[PDB]
Scaffold this active site. Structure first.
Site, mmCIF file in Angstrom:
data_model
loop_
_atom_site.group_PDB
_atom_site.id
_atom_site.type_symbol
_atom_site.label_atom_id
_atom_site.label_comp_id
_atom_site.label_asym_id
_atom_site.label_seq_id
_atom_site.Cartn_x
_atom_site.Cartn_y
_atom_site.Cartn_z
ATOM 1 N N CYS B 110 -43.731 66.604 -86.062
ATOM 2 C CA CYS B 110 -43.085 67.899 -86.195
ATOM 3 C C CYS B 110 -41.954 68.016 -85.187
ATOM 4 C CB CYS B 110 -44.079 69.060 -86.058
ATOM 5 S SG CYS B 110 -43.250 70.641 -86.006
ATOM 6 N N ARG B 113 -41.533 71.586 -82.578
ATOM 7 C CA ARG B 113 -42.560 71.904 -81.596
ATOM 8 C C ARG B 113 -42.041 72.602 -80.350
ATOM 9 N NH1 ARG B 113 -45.177 66.419 -80.424
ATOM 10 N NH2 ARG B 113 -43.559 65.502 -81.817
ATOM 11 N N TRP B 282 -40.699 78.242 -89.901
ATOM 12 C CA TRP B 282 -39.532 78.496 -90.710
ATOM 13 C C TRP B 282 -38.924 77.138 -91.041
ATOM 14 C CZ3 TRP B 282 -40.005 80.587 -85.726
ATOM 15 C CH2 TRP B 282 -39.387 79.811 -84.728
ATOM 16 N N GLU B 287 -35.109 70.298 -95.334
ATOM 17 C CA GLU B 287 -36.372 70.179 -96.036
ATOM 18 C C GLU B 287 -36.213 70.690 -97.457
ATOM 19 O OE1 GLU B 287 -39.956 71.176 -93.422
ATOM 20 O OE2 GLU B 287 -38.464 72.504 -92.519
#
Ligand code: HEM
Ligand code: HEM
Ligand SMILES: CCN(CC)CCc1cc(F)c(F)c(CCc2cc(C)cc(N)n2)c1
Ligand SMILES: CCN(CC)CCc1cc(F)c(F)c(CCc2cc(C)cc(N)n2)c1
Ligand SMILES: C[C@H](O)[C@H](O)[C@H]1CNc2nc(N)[nH]c(=O)c2N1
Ligand SMILES: C[C@H](O)[C@H](O)[C@H]1CNc2nc(N)[nH]c(=O)c2N1
Ligand SMILES: [Zn+2]
Lengths: 420, 414
Positions: B110, B113, B282, B287
């Protein structure tokens, strides 16, 4: 168990890897820590740095010859058992051994074949090997390299080639090409603190100057060759410019583009890596092929510590460079790489876009899993530096492992050379 | 032992000592790397749970400068009583919040973070029915959406007990569009979701059979048959996708939901397994703009965008694919920012993650990270993470993958 599957998540093709069972040296990863994004994860060599004992070199020689004769459907044949005992006595009587022409070509081809980081490997067996093991001086290295470049350039119809200078012996008699690549542009530290040319090569460009090279102090100044033979001080040679094929970069729509005064050379030729075969170390083995367009247009032009012409190109494009979210870098990046491809192709200089290359590499993966039980591949490096997920390799699981023969990194000679 | 990682664009060198605290396996061997394998690969007994509990409790009391304390030692004792009497134990609310925050912090894949400590934890461990789950999730959505000013949040349902009473959100994400395969082989909607769409339709969902049908929650509570629920439409914040320069882009009829909310993963804290733990943040633009729209097995709008861009689609080397991917991604960012729905571009996000990574090396001794996932799926080398070396190791608490519930659930009705 004794199998490892890789999956393509865009096609659900699953390949089954057994070839990794032949991997010899460490990747750097452990069960507890993965190092697949470490550029130099392991130092697991196959021998001590300077000439190794018999019980050190011979096991590696035996393994390679074993592989070579197995490769050609012998093993245990008269010639294989003879070659073994010939390598034995040669090590006994010289602390090294010499490769046959056949074994030398086999090894080079397979070091390319085993280059986990190379997207171009579908060509691997189509490599021209120049045997330069008789070379004794930097002048001779210069002649061999000139011929390499001229053969490899072939007027733009580029051809893959490797030129192999003598193997390392005691380690103080290394043959080295000090240039990282046979053809790089100079980088000039400017008075203010900025940088003219190619910033990557600022240090090498200074060694060249510090060796008497008279820099034209331009943007695209082809660096001289800095050749080291049998451990001696390196010597400067100016490559004949008629041998350095260069492409001026223009754009098929943005006609203002060629007015950026950009060009690049046609021949990529890695000259600082070490080719390892049966425990022999070929410390000078310049090898060349042809560019994937992204190497020039994404990395050479757009990395911040490189040419960094993103800034300029976007300006001319009339992009909002206030914030990152306009994607002005991404837009200019694409246009630059269109220009690079278009220019190379218009001059019939062999180049491959990152779509075609990555697609070729998937095919090569399939070929390799079918005929070899696997194909070592470094996703971090195979995946091109722009448009990652719209290329087939992004979605392709890859097993990475170290097969021999191989290309290895090696210290820059100036960190290690005691001068004379 | 120490380990160094180099940024090759900046030459900054960080020193990782935190990898020593890892235990769960990467799947890499000493002689093979699996760094690009997506999944490198049912209830803990008392003996297994003891040291896992101990380690988490130890780590929690360390994080709050109460290690070795009286409260630490009674907690350890209290946990042991439970693992003896009940063969499991119950996290305190503090521990649950801390665990959920650290599973995020530990999520090597991720890039977002830097926000890990601002995580809104909703304790749903009192939930008993799929209706309760529907309610918990609706509130999650409403809270996390926050009228476009999105807030990170996780809702945590009862942990696993014997494996036969699992809570699961069957949806891979809380908000997804349906996909329908047509007789002729074409796909309407999101092709990635055709399987789940079939399951919902099978469970009684009446699909509108359109391009952007928000799928229904398929909620399983306590190991029972999962039940369908329709997220209230006014809780699904959505962004029509337009382009600041191409007036024709809006004619693509494109929209996307504002709230990315993963619901198919498993939260592991101290050996406890939270099989239902949907979390939300969010979006990074890419993506939606690179994967959701442009993956060949997703919405595949590169063809249409390139055509309306007049791009020459005969030769790859024209980079029509590349060039249209960018414009799609500009549109996605512009659309969200215009509608004041939170979103982050890949540049800002990678930059923030580099600062986060450096800070985590400073204050924590490292930051495990999956370069294969951290690098955005477009324009990779012009983002700082590309040139940033990264160590991947598995710290617990962690988010883990788990089998799809329809491959393991055994049905109860009829
Ligand atoms: C023929 C066309 C070729 C193409 C398109 C190609 C492509 C590439 C690319 C894009 C990389 C990554 C470059 C970077 O970003 O540094 C790479 C790495 C590499 N290639 Fe190839 N290559 C070709 C030929 C060859 C040949 C002929 C050899 C050896 C004889 C070779 C051996 C290697 C090796 C060892 C690496 C790893 C370099 C490193 O680790 O720094 N390649 N290749
Ligand atoms: C707040 C803003 C956030 C952003 C911008 C963000 C961004 C991303 C991105 C781009 C990925 C890669 C996923 C993919 O490309 O398929 C990812 C993965 C992930 N994120 Fe975040 N994320 C955010 C918040 C969170 C939160 C709140 C959690 C949990 C509390 C979380 C946990 C994860 C996990 C576990 C993964 C791994 C996915 C996997 O392993 O399959 N993230 N994130
Ligand atoms: C860490 C990586 N850095 C430092 C060495 C590389 C910089 C660099 C500089 C070049 F001039 C250059 F050609 C490359 C590409 C390598 C390559 C080799 C071959 C045979 C074909 C091909 N197409 N590409 C990389
Ligand atoms: C590996 C499987 N993936 C790719 C095929 C599924 C596709 C997909 C669908 C989503 F709805 C979705 F949010 C993601 C990204 C996950 C995520 C989570 C959080 C908290 C924030 C954020 N920004 N992103 C991926
Ligand atoms: C095969 C490869 O591991 C796979 O495509 C991964 C690569 N990296 C990724 N990175 C992100 N952020 N998201 C992904 O889905 C993937 N997919
Ligand atoms: C940190 C990271 O490993 C490093 O920047 C790598 C990433 N992948 C790469 N891939 C290629 N082809 N060339 C590179 O120089 C790099 N750099
Ligand atoms: Zn690894």
């Amino acid at each position: 168990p004794r199998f490892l599957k890789v999956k393509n998540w865009e096609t659900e093709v699953v390949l089954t890897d057994t070839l990794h069972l032949k991997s010899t040296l460490e990747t750097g990863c452990t069960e507890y820590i993965c190092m697949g994004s470490i550029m130099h994860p392991s130092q697991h060599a196959r021998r001590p740095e300077d000439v190794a004992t018999k019980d050190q070199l011979f096991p590696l020689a035996k393994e390679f010859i074993d592989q070579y004769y197995s490769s050609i459907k012998r093993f245990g044949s008269k010639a294989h058992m003879e070659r073994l005992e010939e390598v034995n006595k040669e090590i006994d009587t010289t602390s090294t051994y010499q490769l046959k022409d056949t074994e030398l070509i086999y090894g080079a081809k397979h070091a390319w074949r085993n280059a986990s980081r190379c997207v171009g490997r579908i060509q691997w067996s189509k490599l021209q090997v120049f045997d330069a093991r008789d070379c004794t001086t930097a002048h001779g290295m210069f002649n061999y390299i000139c011929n390499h470049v001229k053969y490899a350039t072939n007027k733009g119809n580029l051809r893959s080639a490797i030129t192999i200078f003598p193997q390392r012996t005691d380690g103080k008699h290394d043959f080295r090409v000090w240039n990282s690549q046979l053809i790089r542009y100079a980088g000039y530290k400017q008075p203010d603190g900025s940088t003219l040319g190619d910033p990557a090569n600022v240090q090498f460009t200074e060694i060249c100057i510090q060796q008497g090279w008279k820099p034209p102090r331009g943007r695209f100044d082809v660096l001289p060759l800095l050749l080291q033979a049998n451990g001696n001080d390196p010597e400067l040679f100016q490559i004949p410019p008629e041998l350095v094929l260069e492409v001026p970069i223009r754009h098929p729509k943005f006609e203002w583009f060629k007015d950026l005064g950009l060009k690049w050379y046609g021949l990529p030729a890695v000259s600082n890596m070490l080719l390892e075969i049966g425990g022999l170390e070929f410390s000078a083995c310049p090898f060349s092929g042809w560019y994937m367009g992204t190497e020039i247009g994404v990395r050479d032009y757009c990395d911040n510590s490189r040419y960094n012409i993103l800034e300029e190109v976007a300006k001319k494009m009339n992009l909002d460079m206030r914030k990152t979210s306009s994607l002005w870098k991404d837009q200019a990046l694409v246009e630059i790489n269109i220009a690079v491809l278009y220019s190379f192709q218009s001059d019939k200089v062999t180049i491959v876009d990152h779509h075609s290359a990555t697609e070729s590499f998937i095919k090569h993966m399939e070929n390799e899993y079918r005929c070899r039980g696997g194909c070592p591949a470094d996703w971090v490096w195979i995946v091109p530096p722009m448009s990652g997920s719209i290329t087939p390799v992004f979605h392709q699981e890859m097993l990475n492992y170290r097969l021999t023969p191989s290309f290895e990194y090696q210290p820059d000679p100036w960190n290690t050379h005691v001068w004379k």
